[PDB]
Design a protein around this nucleic acid. Structure first.
Lengths: 43, 89, 274
RNA sequence: UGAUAUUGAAAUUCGUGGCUUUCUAACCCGCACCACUUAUCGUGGUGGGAGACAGUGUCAGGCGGGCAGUUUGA
RNA sequence: GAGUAGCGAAAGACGGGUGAGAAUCCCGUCCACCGAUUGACUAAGGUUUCCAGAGGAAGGCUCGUCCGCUCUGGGUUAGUCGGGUCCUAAGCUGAGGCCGACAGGCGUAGGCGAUGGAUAACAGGUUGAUAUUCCUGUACCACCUAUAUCGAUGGGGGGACGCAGUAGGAUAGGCGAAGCGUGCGAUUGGAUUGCACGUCUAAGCAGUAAGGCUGAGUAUUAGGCAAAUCCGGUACUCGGGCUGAGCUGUGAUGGGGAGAUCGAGUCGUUGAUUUCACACUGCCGAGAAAAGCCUCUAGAUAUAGGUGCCCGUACCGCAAACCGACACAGGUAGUCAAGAUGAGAAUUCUAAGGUGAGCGAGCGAACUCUCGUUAAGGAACUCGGCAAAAUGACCCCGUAACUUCGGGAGAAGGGGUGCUCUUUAGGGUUAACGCCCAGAAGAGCCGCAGUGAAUAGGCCCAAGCGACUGUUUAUCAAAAACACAGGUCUCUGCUAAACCGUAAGGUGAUGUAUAGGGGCUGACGCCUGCCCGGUG
């Protein structure tokens, strides 16, 4: 059976990722939130 | 510069077989070209270079008590000589 | 005329088709083509705003001359051609300068004969000229609506209108739908009827031949659920259990008029007919 | 669908008020040409078309399972 | 619960060796299994699993001396391969701009963006681990220096394109040879051209090459935002260019070989799903863009040595390295693909190559599963012929109603099919012999049986429904439900109705009443009666 999640390096970085996040006002809110929690990776 | 370009020579089985010919191996700075590695080997050793091949190597996993950690990333360059020899000893 | 097929297959049982005997060449003039990528009923936002549009055959746009501008310079018809984007055929007319451009082909122009534009031409098929210079009782086509803009009325296969009267600066005319209306006298028109009069008697024949044209299937509202259509719901088959039939957005859709009041053309139209 | 603001002009008409006409200066044109300009955006100029209408704000009446919140005894 | 269930599709055996310990590790022989794949490549994805030494705690459904596991040392080399320093599509962004309580939405010039266009390298050797990258040999491309031309930021040409169909030219590959090389020659009754293998080598250069396309000159000028000798028109005379697979040379005097430092590389025939090539013919559904490239003018002033950057390159890749929590009977684009048999890429057996399945040894109870056979009967079984059985290929003779004249039709129903020997008509290629491909008639021989195995429709009669191909409840429903071609009503005159959105902007549509949106009906045939009081 085909499963969800067929991985894809370039799709992964265009939908989730630093520049995509820093493009929207709500994406910068995600990254602010993860910084005050102290996550080791932000995106 | 020209001593920032070159870091240290490599001494293994595959490199001692290469200087049976006139091929010498160094570990260089990770941010330089072929054409800088070529113009730095004559300024230091005073030889005449015929070619330079470069390789980028990626960081390797390495544990000490099953830990995290990666080695440095490396850039090693094989230079061919037309005139002379490098006695790196 | 209309090529009729033998019933070799159930698909081609009652299926007809044009014979294409008027089309003189079978390849466009390369310097007059644009791309035409499909926009299949989807707008800015990317949402389907018009139903039943989809993926057909690929097409290139040909640049048609709807405002006939080159006046007092003759043009010889070089070729009649096929256009995928409209229901009429098109003609390639070469000017006396060496300037080629397409024209909508009228019902009775053959390859070779000449045409011309401007307010000093002959009243014969293929010519264009303002509406103050057309004698009452002529059938025209490709009728402008604002001067300089280009023709907009009577551009389908077999379409025409005829001039009726004259006011001070306007002109009476009856359209293909029987509505009577006055148009400004400075707006041009072409003499004749649009060709391809047998385009309507074609019997498509297959479901898959309407998928080649870009039409996608229609689900009747009766066989939907109540969250989809006002006509949805019910035991088995149901009648339209409402005073009037409704559209998929809940407006009345049989007899109820939708033209909006306070329009600037409320003066210009005389006799109405849909 | 009305009143009213943006909103002006001259006349005819029957009772200083209304009605209807006509005019154009306001407003409008997904309209032609010319600049910015490499530009099917925009802004400005020029001809044309329409014009005190339309569009827009406030107030008012109709319609309104298209869409909401709910009630539907012991 | 309990020393219980299970231990995940499939064949192993023995000998020798290593070790404290061997069904399980390494070497050998034989046997088996896949082979349009259990073989060879390569995208994606994964990230060191790759290689060599060493180890046996845990992981491995058993064991382990072994490992994709642990330990410490290594391994990826490019002017030409693929990507950037080149082009653009859908989309994504967008100076100024337009819109909006805020936040922001939209959009112009202009940019980003391959799954497409452009673009200069080949053969052989070599490592434990890389190679069109290193080495040997022979090349080609851009630039730089020594020894009129350049030319648009602009114009034109080009680039530049669908689907189907058949015929042809080649070549790769296969096959056969008393063509010639090499290397054997039998201890089971026989035989001795008798048995096995081999039978060639690029890019580049410079030659000629089936086929495919198609008038060429001169003058002229109201067009291509200015210009033009270029293009597009017009009038005149007169009726060889530019592309293209292959082949030959010569490379290179070398390189590789069946093999014993030496060593052959001929002839015939079958031939593509590759190439000439979307060429040619036909059809209607009418089949990207941009740069490189070639010209035009606004304008402007032939050998000798060198130089050539960045990123990827290991290994798995129908799999124990990827997605499925697992060393999981599932899923995972593309290229290559031999012999016998055949229409075949089907079937059965084999090649090149790979593999023997990470628990076993016994015994041969019930009962469960998967498979084979069955007296006499032959649907009596059962809700129901469910399941099983039977049919099955090629050839020939034959074939009903009904029909929309196409069908029904492989209707039904019958007969043939192995091998040997005679004689007999031709058709591919060649000067012949040859070498392939097919037929007809006769006379025999064997068996229970001759598509002797494997793979390959059961038929008929009548009734309801839906015309038909098609679509659907991923994971209890595939249908009489949905589509549909056709029919009908209605709304809509263009800044159209309709629809998305606060608007701006859009779809409709670069369309214009033979057009578009919505409601119902549902091929085709013959038809569709009455009622406008109530509601719209």
């Amino acid at each position: 059976v085909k499963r969800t999640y067929q991985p894809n390096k370039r799709k992964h970085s265009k939908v989730h990722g630093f520049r995509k996040r820093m493009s929207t006002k709500n994406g910068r809110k995600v990254l602010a939130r993860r910084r005050r929690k102290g996550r080791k990776v932000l995106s | 510069e020209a001593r920032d370009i070159l870091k240290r020579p490599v001494i293994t089985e595959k490199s001692s077989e290469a200087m049976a010919e006139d091929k010498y191996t160094f570990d260089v700075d990770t941010r330089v070209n072929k054409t800088q590695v070529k113009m730095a080997v004559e300024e230091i050793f005073n030889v005449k270079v015929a070619s330079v091949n470069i390789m980028n190597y990626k960081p390797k996993k390495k544990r000490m008590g099953r830990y995290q950690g990666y080695t440095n990333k490396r850039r090693k360059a094989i230079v061919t000589l037309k005139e002379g020899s490098i006695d790196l000893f | 005329a209309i090529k009729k097929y033998k019933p070799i297959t159930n698909g081609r049982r009652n299926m007809t088709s044009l014979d294409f005997a008027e089309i003189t060449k079978t390849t466009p003039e390369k310097s007059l083509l644009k791309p035409l990528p499909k926009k299949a009923g989807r707008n800015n936002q990317g949402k389907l705003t018009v139903r039943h549009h989809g993926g057909g055959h690929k097409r290139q746009y040909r640049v048609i001359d709807f405002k006939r501008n080159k006046d007092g310079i003759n043009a010889k018809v070089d070729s009649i051609q096929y256009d995928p984007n409209r229901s009429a055929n098109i003609a390639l007319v070469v000017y006396a300068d060496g300037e080629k451009r397409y024209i909508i082909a009228p019902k009775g122009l053959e390859v070779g004969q000449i045409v011309e534009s401007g307010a000093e031409a002959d009243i014969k098929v293929g010519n264009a000229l303002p509406l103050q210079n057309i004698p009452v009782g002529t059938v025209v086509h490709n009728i402008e609506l604002k001067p300089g803009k280009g023709g907009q009325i009577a551009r389908s296969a077999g379409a025409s209108a005829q001039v009726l009267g004259k006011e001070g600066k306007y002109v009476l005319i009856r359209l293909r739908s029987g509505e009577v209306r006055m148009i400004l006298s400075t707006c041009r028109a072409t003499i004749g009827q649009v060709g391809n009069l047998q385009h309507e008697l074609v019997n498509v024949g297959k479901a898959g031949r309407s998928r080649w044209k870009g039409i996608r299937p229609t689900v009747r509202g009766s066989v939907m659920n109540p969250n989809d259509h006002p006509h949805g719901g019910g035991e088995g088959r149901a009648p339209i259990g409402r005073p009037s039939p409704m559209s998929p957005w809940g407006k009345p859709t049989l007899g109820k008029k939708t033209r909006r009041g306070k329009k600037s053309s409320d003066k210009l139209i005389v006799r109405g007919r849909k």
